[PDB]
Amino acid sequence: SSALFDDIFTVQTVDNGRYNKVSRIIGISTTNAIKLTLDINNEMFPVSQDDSLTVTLANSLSWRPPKPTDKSLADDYDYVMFGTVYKFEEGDEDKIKVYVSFGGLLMCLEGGYKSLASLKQDNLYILIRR
Amino acid sequence: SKEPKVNIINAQDDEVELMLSDVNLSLANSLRRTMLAEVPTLAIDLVEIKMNTSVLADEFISHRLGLIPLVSEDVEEMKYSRDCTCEDYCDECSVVLELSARHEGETTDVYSSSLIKVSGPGNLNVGEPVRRDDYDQGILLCKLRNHQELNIRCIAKKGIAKEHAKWSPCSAIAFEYDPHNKLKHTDFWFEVDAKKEWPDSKYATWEEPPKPGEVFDYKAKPNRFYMTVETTGSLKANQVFSRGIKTLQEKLANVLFELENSRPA
Amino acid sequence: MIIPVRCFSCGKVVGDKWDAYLRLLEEGKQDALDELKLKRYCCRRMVLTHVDLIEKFLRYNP
Amino acid sequence: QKKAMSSRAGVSQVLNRYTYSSTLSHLRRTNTPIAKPRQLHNTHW
Amino acid sequence: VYGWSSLVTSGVIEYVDGEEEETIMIAMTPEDLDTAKRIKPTFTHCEIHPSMILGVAASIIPFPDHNQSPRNTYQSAMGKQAMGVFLTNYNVRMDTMANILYYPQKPLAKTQAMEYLKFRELP
Amino acid sequence: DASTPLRSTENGIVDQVLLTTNQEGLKFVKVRMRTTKVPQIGDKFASRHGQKGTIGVTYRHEDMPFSAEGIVPDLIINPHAIPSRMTVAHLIECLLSKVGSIRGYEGDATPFTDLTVDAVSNLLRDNGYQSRGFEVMYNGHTGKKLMAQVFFGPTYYQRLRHMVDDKIHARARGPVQVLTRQPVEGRSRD
Amino acid sequence: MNAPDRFELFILPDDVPKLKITPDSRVPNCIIIKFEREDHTLANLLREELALYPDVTFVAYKVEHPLFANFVMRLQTEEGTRPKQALERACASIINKLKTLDHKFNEEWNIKNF
Amino acid sequence: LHKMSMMAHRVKVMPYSTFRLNLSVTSPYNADFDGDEMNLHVPQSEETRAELSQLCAVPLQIVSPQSNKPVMGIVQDTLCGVRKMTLRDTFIEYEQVMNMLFWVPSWDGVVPQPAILKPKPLWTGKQLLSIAIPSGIHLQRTDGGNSLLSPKDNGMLIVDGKVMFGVVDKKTVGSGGGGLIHTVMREKGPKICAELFGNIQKVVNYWLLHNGFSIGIGDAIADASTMKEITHAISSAKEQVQEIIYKAQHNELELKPGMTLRESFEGEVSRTLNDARDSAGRSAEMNLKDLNNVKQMVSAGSKGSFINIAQMSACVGQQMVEGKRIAFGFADRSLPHFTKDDFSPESKGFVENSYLRLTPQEFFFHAMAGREGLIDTAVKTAETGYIQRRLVK
Amino acid sequence: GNLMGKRVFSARTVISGDPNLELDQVGVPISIAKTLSYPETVTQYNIHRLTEYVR
Ligand SMILES: [Zn+2]
Ligand SMILES: [Zn+2]
């Protein structure tokens, strides 16, 4: 029931290759080697080049409707997708990169410091803010 | 007054434009079709031809009369031949009509006006050859020459549009909502510009324009529907809406009633 | 082959409208449909396409 | 007739009456007693 | 008093069999010979009208000059199998099988040729 | 007996009987039977473009998809019968005829003339609807608009003969042949 | 020839209840209601007003096949709350909404001159 | 002519006068509904029946021994739509994601966690379409620029029986080799896979019922300037012909060994018009957006191809019989409307026009060309059957 | 003509596909089912149902 990632990146660019409602964006990390590739709903959450977003992951807080108005809300963000990750690739050196697909939305992460944080399970909630 | 609300626009005798707001499309639509198909009416159903020298065949005319619009005001205080305890038919559930046409005027025409009402109306608005024609003989049944005769005898009954189209009093019904595609319940086809190539609807003036600077609203739902209820006669454009609103209700009722009949046991 | 009572497509009556139409032509020399109250093409096509055979059939003897 | 069936059947048929354009067509028809003939030649224009 | 017999008795039109055809030069459009229309590319005779190279069948087909030819060839057959009115006296005819479409309807679109195929009166 | 029986698959109403002489002074008598035949979930139809097809089902007005105007289709053919058939004029007759519908003027489709798709489309924009035919439609079951638009427009359709009920045939041990003793041929003779 | 008699689209035939309710084993607290002689007109309307009782955990409906005028409605609710009830309620909420409608359309009408 | 031209079916008595068969079992018999009729036989012994259900059941037939691949896939509507529903842009909300899960009969009775929760809780086709795919179904693809994050959303990857990435169409659900069907049959069995159809169907067909889809002249018209860019690709192509005709009417060309000076003339004219026509269409192909319905019906793989678009929006093509452009039936000419010895393309049968927009000449040649076609489709039809019959006896 | 192939409990009509029929089904017009039969021997498992079908 813990978090598995926290880091702010900066939109290097936003791509809409023939998609009226979705854009695959990329951005590097502000701390370290860490790049980010992510598809996203430009309609629900607009985003242009050069933005300060905070990306998170982890597993926790059938599928109940709302009613949770009076319940947990690990939604302290403005975009929360659920999906699964498929391949665990190694890009030379000891640099790793996991691939996450959200029921149709692909994603790639890169770096090397979640050697005991990012698991190989299906669980995975993406979060973003500001 | 309360929940959903109406705001009639220009309304006449054969139409009833109006805006229905504060309702779920789901429910608007439901009412939509209910008018189109399940309001009790009154049409000729049984035809007992005696003589017929017309160039048209028996069942061809038979069809014709099935379509001729009859009165259906107090149609609700009549019973379905299926429930009436009378073998076949009677005054308490049917309207009988006569039709005699002798060719005398050396092309004589047969208009729905030429129908008699041989059975006892029991003093209730019903069984009348709805005429809206300028002269006074709406619906030309058929023509005949020199000495061609034609004797019928019609029997009208309740029934609905499900059972047959010859019933539903609706006949075309306009329905639109959110003229400015804000809900994005559509993806406009286009060669270059959707907006310029796609006709703007006369309905766009009772709702506010898009406004570019605004992002896509998502939490918004289909509220408000611009309609128009045309009528063919039988029932007054107003009723063809009321009664509709009501039958749908009667059904929603038994679903709750039928329910009860199943708790005791 | 006579006029069709009510339009197939939508349902609006149209039996009476025959003579009115075939008249607004011969005389008033006329659009006709539009004034006869036949809006949307469904019913429009109804009248504007009828070929009244009954006339010729009627030209036969007994 | 006779022991002479060595004739050709087809000449004279039963005039079509399904539709008007059916009948017209039928009268304006041609035959040809039996890969090149079936072709639409130029001369056919 | 000006038939087709006169259009011929004045040398304004000629009857060209297939053989004689060989040695003449025929002009299509009498006149002529927009980014929409179809691109168009000694004369002795001109064509009454190209849309006359068609026979009864195709004559009822709308824009036969816009379909895959093999299709036109099909409709060319199905027409002889639709319903309508084959005569008006039908009510005094004792023939096995015959069908009449309750209510006919001349088409919303037509061939100028239909005018001689009495099609508008027998859809 | 030499009396005549109404064909087993048939039925209707007598429409005209008549007695008559023969060259040989014999008694000639023909009988005519009538029947109204209604279109059924199987009967064949087609336009004038080799666009033949049969009925798969029949829905009503409610169930039917529709356009704001009210106007609803009488027929719904599949967009798939267009791409490989290539018969485009079909598509054109519709457009043109959707104008001739509104304009009252006869729409000429005649062969090689001076009428174009670009032209008709302009005439259709003067009347009110999309310049290409397409119209918005709301799904007859839910009322919600259709994410797409449709090529809705009046087209001529011939009702080819060949109705199901003249073909439907089923047998289990019926009239056996004589020489062979096998069944007999044809649905008419069972 | 093989087509039913029209009146089979609304009349219940020999011993048949509008409703037949069956418990669903697939998941807990769930049911499938068979509505006889009905359609979207009434189905979708009931389906709808149930995603309104945020106390209903599930609600979809369907027409098995178009030849037959019937339809199945599946409902699942929160703990110790019977769906049948939620069906009643969501069903009643429906009539009221319409009761109001009828009324609001009648006073409105009278105020017309044409 | 197939082991599959006859198959055992489960009987379902229904109303209305007609045999109602499933779509996916269409291509085996090779039927359509334009009037086609079907014969039905009824077993009579207790074993006769068994023999019919244990070896001739439709489910057993899914993988055809003649081409060691299935022989029944998802056709028309179901195919075409399954494609749309898959795109990253395709999203569905609760109200419908529910009525969709309901239509899948095997549904576990569990709504899968939304592919989106943030503002609005939505799902994507890829998600729900997947509820139809049984557990343990592993599928991997790779088209062109396809790599574990398929940019153009190519390829296909399904793990544990859930679509991970890529769009679904003819390639992934057709009567093809890798075929998700071919795989589900092999991995789960005749039964499980046979059910798979109905589901993938029921969900999709339903969805399409609501998303709608159509086609109209509008799908066949080319951009304002493209229709021009083409015209002059025929003009220039016309001169690259007038040019080699001048250079032939001067004996200024050598005979490519083995060919006649004349034949070699054709060989170029033909190769000139063909390459012309080839791009004429290709200009429009890339000129039809990802919204053009006709295009859509081609990508899905449910009907028609490039060629088709071409002949309808660009150039119809060159007509031909017996392999050579419209002959000289009339001494030294195509039609009497032509000057003798005209070897050009406007005479030999090259229809430069598009269906959307043929000239008499073009229109005619074209006919003479098709006429040859119709011919063998009406000859090879029974001679092929003889050759067949022999092999059998 | 008569031995290597003969006319044979069979029926034939017009097909139209139905998108709500399991892959392996085949909708048969009531009319036809009421025509084609099937010789099922009486057995103490189906006597009850058969005596009903017979009535
Ligand atoms: Zn009574
Ligand atoms: Zn109408």
Q: Which residues on chain C are in Cβ contact (under 8 Å) with B170?
A: 11
H129: left (phi over 0), alpha (psi -120 to 50) or beta: alpha
Q: Is F143 exposed, middle or buried (0-12, 13-18, 19+ CB in 10 A)?
A: buried
CB contact under 8 A, C50 and E120: no
User: B142: annotated binding-site residue?
Assistant: no
To the question of whether residue H34 is assigned a binding role by annotation, the answer is yes
C30: containing domain: 1-62
| Residue E41 contacts H where some CB pair is shorter than 8 Å | yes
Calpha distance F65→F76 (Å, rounded): 9
Which residues lie closer than 8 Å to A39 by C-beta, 6 or more apart? A22, A23, A24, A25, A102, A105, A106, A107, H88
List the shell of residues around ion ligand 2, using CB closer than 5 Å.
C 7, 9-10, 42-43
- Using CB atoms, which residue from H10, H35, H195 is nearest to I14? H35
Q: Give the Å distance between the CA of B95 and the centre of ligand 1.
A: 10
Q: How far apart are CA C41 and CA F104, in angstroms?
A: 10
G54 chain-A contacts, CB cut-off 8 A? 65-67
Ligand that comes closest to the CA of residue F154: 2
What distance in Å separates the CA atoms of residue A5 and residue A114, rounded to the nearest whole number? 8
Ligand 1 centroid, distance to H302 Cα (angstroms)? 57
Does H contact E via 3+ CB–CB distances below 8 Å? Answer: yes
For domain A2-130, the CATH architecture is Beta Barrel (2.40)
Sign of CA dihedral D22, D23, D24, D28: positive
Facing I26 at nearest CB: one of H12, H77, H205: H12
* Chain G residues with beta carbon closer than 8 angstroms to that of F63: 39-40, 66
- Here the tokens at position H197 are 């159809």
The CATH number that applies at residue C33 is: 1.10.10.60
Q: G58 - beta bridge partners? A: G76
With contacts defined as CB-CB under 8 Å, which chain C residues touch B133? 16, 20
Cβ of I30 and H78 within 8 Å? no
Which segments of E79-114 does DSSP mark as H helices, in order?
none
Overall domain count for chain C: 1
Total count of residues recorded for chain C: 62
Those residues with Cβ within 8 angstroms of residue F70's Cβ, 6 or more apart along the chain or in another chain: B172, B173, B174, B175, B228, B230, C10, C40, C42
Q: Where in chain B is the domain with CATH 2.170.120.12?
A: 41-165
Min Cα–Cα distance to chain F from E11, Å: 27
- Chain D touched by H336 (CB under 8 Å): yes
The ligand placed nearest to the CA atom of residue C33 is 2
Name the closest residue on chain F to residue C30, using Cα atoms: F104
Structure tokens at A88: 């665990």
C-alpha closest to that of F66 among H374, H288, B90, H212: H212
Task: Name the neighbours of I, counting chains with at least 3 Cβ pairs within 8 A.
Answer: F, G, H
Which residues in chain H have Cβ-Cβ distances shorter than 8 Å to G48?
A: 95
% helix / strand / coil in chain I, to the nearest 5? 20, 20, 60
Tokens read off for A28: 């590097």
Contacts with I31 from chain G: Cβ below 8 Å: 1-2
Class of CATH domain B3-40+166-263: alpha beta
Between CA E85 and CA E105 the distance in angstroms is 11
- Architecture field, domain B41-165: Beta Complex (2.170)
Whether B195 contacts chain C with CB within 8 A? no
Rounded Cα gap, residues D44 and D21, in angstroms: 22
Q: Check residue F148 and report its DSSP letter.
A: E
Between CA H237 and CA H229 the distance in angstroms is: 12
Q: Looking at beta carbons, which residues of chain C come within 8 Å of B134? A: 20
Among residues 231-250 of chain B, which lie with CB inside 8 Å of chain C? Answer: 232-233
How far apart are the C-alpha atoms of B144 and C59, rounded to whole Å?
10
Contact check, Cβ <8 Å, E66/F159: no
Range F160-163, long-range pairs (CB < 8 A, 24+ positions)? F160/E78, F160/E81, F160/E82, F160/E83, F160/F44, F160/F45, F160/F46, F160/F52, F161/D18, F161/E81, F161/E82, F161/E83, F161/E99, F162/E81, F162/F43, F162/F44, F162/H35, F163/F37, F163/F39, F163/F40, F163/F42, F163/F43, F163/F44
Please enumerate in sequence order all residues whose Cβ is within 8 A of that of F78, keeping only pairs 6 or more positions apart, or say none. H76, H77
User: Chain B residue with minimal CA distance to E103?
Assistant: B60
A 10 A CB-CB count for H315 gives 29
Which is it for strands B43-47 and B154-157: parallel, antiparallel or unpaired? Answer: antiparallel
Ligand 1 mean position, distance from CA A17 (Å): 71
- DSSP H/E element including H11: strand H10-14
Nearest residue in chain H measured CA to CA from G51? H95
- CA–centroid distance, residue B96 to ligand 1 (Å): 12
Contact: chain G with chain F (3+ CB pairs below 8 Å)? yes
Long-range contacts of H369-377 (CB under 8 A, 24+ apart): H369/H319, H369/H320, H369/H321, H369/H326, H370/E68, H370/E69, H370/E70, H370/E73, H370/H319, H371/D38, H371/D39, H371/D40, H371/H321, H372/D39, H372/H320, H372/H321, H372/H322, H373/E70, H374/E70, H374/E73, H375/D35, H375/D38, H375/D39, H376/D35
Q: Based on the structure, what is the number of domains in chain G?
A: 1
Q: Which of H64, H60, H67 is nearest to H8 (CA)?
A: H60
Ligand 2: centre distance to CA C10 (Å): 4
R_g of chain G computed on alpha carbons: 18
Q: Please name the helix (run of DSSP H) or strand (run of DSSP E) that holds residue G20, with its range, or none.
A: strand G19-23
Q: Do G60 and H109 touch (CB under 8 A)?
A: no
B33/F62 CB distance under 8 A: yes
A117 has a chain B CB within 8 A of its CB: no
| B43 CA distance to ligand 1 middle (Å) | 15
Give chain B's end-to-end CA distance (angstroms, integer): 41
What residues does A25 pair with on adjacent strands? A14, A38
Chain B contact set for F136 (CB, 8 A): 186
Q: Is C43 annotated as a binding residue?
A: yes
Distance from Cα B45 to the centre of ligand 1, integer Å: 14
Which chain G residues are closer than 8 Å to I30 by Cβ?
Answer: 2
Q: Do H368 and D38 touch (CB under 8 A)?
A: no
Q: What is the DSSP string of G68-81?
A: S-EEEEEEEESTT-
Residue type, H243: E
Nearest Cα to F72, choosing from C8, H290, H66? C8
Between chains, do C1 and E106 touch, taking CB under 8 Å as contact? Answer: no
Selecting from D38, D39, D45 the residue whose C-beta is nearest the C-beta of H335 gives D45
C7 belongs to an annotated ligand binding site:
yes
Q: Which residues pair with B100 in a beta bridge?
A: B151
Angle between helices F89-103 and C41-48 (to 10 degrees): 80
Please check whether residue B6 is in contact with residue G101, taking contact to mean a CB–CB distance below 8 angstroms: yes
Using DSSP's 3-state secondary structure scheme, residue H264 falls into helix
- Does residue E118 sit at the C interface (CB-CB below 8 Å)? no
Distance CA B3, CA A111 (A): 57
H127 touches chain D (CB under 8 A): no
Which is it for strands A96-101 and A84-90: parallel, antiparallel or unpaired?
Answer: antiparallel
What ligand is nearest to the CA atom of residue C17? 2
3-state secondary structure of H200: helix
Rounded CA-CA distance H338/H346 in Å is 10
> Taking the C-alpha atoms of E110, E115, E116 and E117 in order, what is their torsion angle to the nearest 10 degrees?
50
- Enumerate the residues of chain D whose CB falls inside 8 A of the CB of residue E24: none
The answer to whether residues G50 and G94 touch, using CB atoms and an 8 Å cutoff, is: no
**Residue B52 Cα, gap to closest chain E Cα (Å):** 14
Dihedral, I17, I21, I25, I30 alpha carbons, nearest 10: -80
Across the interface, whether the CB atoms of G1 and F165 are under 8 A apart is answered yes
The distance from CA H201 to its chain's CA centroid, rounded to whole angstroms, is 19
- Residue A43 contacts by C-beta under 8 Å, 6 or more apart in sequence? A21, A22, B216, B218
Tokens for F155? 């087209």
Tokens of A26: 């990329």
What does the block give as tokens for C60? 């036969």
Region(s) of chain B under CATH 3.30.1360.10? 3-40+166-263
Ligand 2 centroid vs C39 CA: distance in angstroms?
8
Looking at beta carbons, which residues of chain G come within 8 Å of B26?
44-45, 47-48
Here the tokens at position I44 are 């103490």
Q: What angle do CA B171, B173, B178 make, to 5 degrees?
A: 170
- Look-up of token digits 């979708």: G44
The candidate with the shortest Cα–Cα distance to A9, out of A47, A58, A69, A52, is A52
Q: Which chains touch C (3 or more CB pairs under 8 A)?
A: B, E, F
Indicate yes or no: CB of E94 within 8 angstroms of CB of F96: no
Residue type, G60: A
